[model samples]
Target: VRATYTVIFKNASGLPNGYDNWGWGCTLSYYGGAMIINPQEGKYGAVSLKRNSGSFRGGSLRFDMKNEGKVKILVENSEADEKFEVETISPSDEYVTYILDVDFDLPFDRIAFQDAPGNGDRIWIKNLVHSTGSADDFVDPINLEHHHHHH
Candidate 1:
């Protein structure tokens, strides 16, 4: 997706660090509008983006899926130039995991995960990570890894 993904730690109340301990976050911009996702903030767990750039011409997002029943994961660019869709890939009740490695050469702004027909259920994202080419890559105005909290 064109959007950059980030992972944050939070606590249980869903108040970020106050309720859980850690969570995921993503920043997306499209049609001039921007969206920020902090799972702790209860933002969209996942999103989908159509391709619109050259950098992402063939790069894809990869993730590990596991659970009980069957679920579908889809990846596509806005331009519709590249697409990757997998269905009935994993079982829910068992501890089975599938590695999702998709490659699209266009820049994407969002990534989404939904069951067949778009059912909403919480999915645990473990070892959630993203790559932006360099350590200097910036996902947000603030960098938790380098920023010092003076409180």
Candidate 2:
């Protein structure tokens, strides 16, 4: 996930390292689950990232999404806090990619991970990766470089 400033998803480690999920709707899940270098949705274009969140018709989750080789701007969650979100792509079930921030060393301790918009929205997060190679999901929103580009 690329942003103008820094993007941090602290304690976003997969299971096995399951002891670090200090919080839920923020911990982890499967869309093929987490890889050592990248995170991604499960097989058959599914959702994995989990969230018990609320939406802001006034807010946007900064993320780039992917479906097959089709990538686009980056991107979710729901609850009862006065907000809304959803990922209802036509044809439904589309494979996605993720690039979670690794060098998450900012002076911040938290962030708003707006998944989709809607009340009572509960969605599984796909792989949160650090890089993507296709234009079918999403592109870096703030820049043209992959800083944590895994170079």
Candidate 3:
């Protein structure tokens, strides 16, 4: 099935849409239409999300993040655990956009934003979206926009 998904964080009452929070050593909040996950200092401040069905089919993930400190993006499945250093962001005053290509070849479920102990506090996130479609759709966003610029 082809579909697009967005995570709408309504409140602490529950996780919006069908996503569930599976994390440790952190506090979660919804403020000003954004979700902030603050990890405890010197702890494995991992904030994670997964569908109730417990897996995401092959697709791509995107989101806007405001980094208060160092943060890493990670994904894990029975296939293997992978750290997305390319998607990681350093401390920034403004929100930055990041995306990940979830391997269709590999079976994986959880997505995580990890902050190591001794570094920082909160990471803000919004407009978190994912699409279940052909990998071609992901490449189009990167290539199609460049087609109109001719010099």
Candidate 4:
């Protein structure tokens, strides 16, 4: 099919409320990472940007959000068992990108970047992969197709 697209985050420079030192991913390392997930002026911000054991094979889950006065994006799923949400607003405070498209033939191990009216986990999530190939042939998508009998 050649559409084995995948990307959630490899590394967005050690700060996105989650310290995923790459491979098998992880996030939400507060305080020392200067936790701030929601706010424009009156409050510092951060809402959500979570991950489990990364994998995605639908299309366009791009969110390069930078910041401003509005935020609302909640994408946590077991392929839509009443969990999928969206709201995007940023035209001024620069650095904005948001897309969430899906196909779902199966693969979304776990994901969350939940609701925000403003402080979206202090944005800066400029990160990768949809199989344009050769990310050293990256493979960590919840054991894509059983991962050769993973041990």
Candidate 5:
């Protein structure tokens, strides 16, 4: 199936459409229209977004993170009793759009950005999109380089 879905964080008090805030040990707030993830102080905290329905198979998952500070993405398939570390991104000064080429062996329903390494490093995520096909489905935004970490 050729389809695309995007979840945008509009404000701090609400979760994106059709998504649930499965975050713990952290707080979600809005800063400049981006979801600011404030993880627990001096502890390894996580912020997650889980789909209310449906799941994602083999596709490219894309999102933006500012001050990423080495974030790890975890994909989970609750029904299938499966979970794994998909990818980990390094720190960036500006907002970096990470396009992960995920060839999921199992359909995953939830994704999390974890292991903030708590030195007051707040990761802000704005647009999180999942599209059918691999990284070739869309073009990278103007000047940003494609750091498409292949799975």
Candidate 6:
């Protein structure tokens, strides 16, 4: 099954020092989860599962921002970690898409979006989609390229 969730932070200035700061946390049944997109340091951000034991085989996480910023997406595994830098994209016009392929056959309990610390305080996240199978099975491969900004 596939699910899409949107996190809207109003009057939210920025993130905190450690990974524990920022984002919202909630509990569903016996499992608990949190989304850490923009941290206080503004440098590192993440979406973590506080207490979960589900097997997430293959899926892609997408971030759409309203402001322009430097972000690096990282996936933490049991043995190794995978990192990918999302190019500087304009959010005034459209949303920037960052795709990470799950190569390792391990479950990722946490995902982070590292950003550069700066004065810019406000940020808006559009949507987060979780799917099964290949990346193409979720999003259009052609729409993954960089696009120009209108605003």
- In model 5, which regions exceed 4 Å deviation? 1-13, 116-120, 139-151
Judged by TM-score relative to the true structure, which candidate is superior, 3 or 6?
3
Question: How do the predictions measure up, each by TM-score?
Answer: 0.38, 0.26, 0.70, 0.26, 0.79, 0.46
User: Candidate 5, TM-score vs. the true structure?
Assistant: 0.79
Candidate number with greatest lDDT = 5
- Kindly report which residue stretches of model 6 are placed more than 4 angstroms away from their true locations once superposed: 1-38, 41-51, 78-93, 97-100, 116-123, 139-151
User: Residue 11 of model 6: what lDDT?
Assistant: 23
> Candidate 5, after superposition: displacement of residue 120 in Å?
4.9
Sorted by TM-score, highest first, which candidate order results?
5, 3, 6, 1, 4, 2
Question: Which candidate's TM-score is highest?
Answer: 5
lDDT of model number 3: 0.65
1-151, model 2: which lDDT tens digit per residue? 4322323232234532211222223223444432211213232122232332321121223333332222212222223222122233221234343433322222211223322322222233333322322333435543455466764
Which structure is stronger by lDDT: 1 or 6?
6
Q: CA RMSD for every model? A: 11.9, 11.5, 6.0, 14.2, 6.0, 10.2
lDDT digits (tens) for residues 25-48 of candidate 4:
123333322322333443323343
Q: Write the per-residue lDDT of candidate 1 for residues 1-151, one digit (tens) a residue.
A: 3545533221112222211212123332222111222222234334443223333322323344443333455554545555556334554543233333445455544344543423233343322334443323334322344476652
Better of 2 and 4 by lDDT: 4
Tens digit per residue, CA lDDT, model 6, 17-122? 1223222321111111222243444224333422133334446555555544554444454335533332343344344554445564566545444444443323
* lDDT score, candidate 5: 0.72
| True-vs-predicted CA distance for residue 17, candidate 1, Å | 13
TM-score of 2: 0.26
Expressed as tens digits, the lDDT of each residue in 17-42 for candidate 3 is: 77677778888888776778888888
Which residue runs does candidate 1 get wrong by more than 4 Å?
Answer: 1-57, 78-83, 86-88, 94-98, 117-122, 131-151
Full-model lDDT, candidate 6 = 0.39
Q: Which is the better candidate, 1 or 6, if ranked by TM-score?
A: 6
Candidate 1 residue 81 Cα shift, in angstroms, is 9.2
Cand. 2 Cα-lDDT: 0.29
Q: After superposition, how far is residue 94 of candidate 3 from its true place, in Å?
A: 0.8
Per-candidate clashes come to: 41, 54, 0, 14, 0, 7
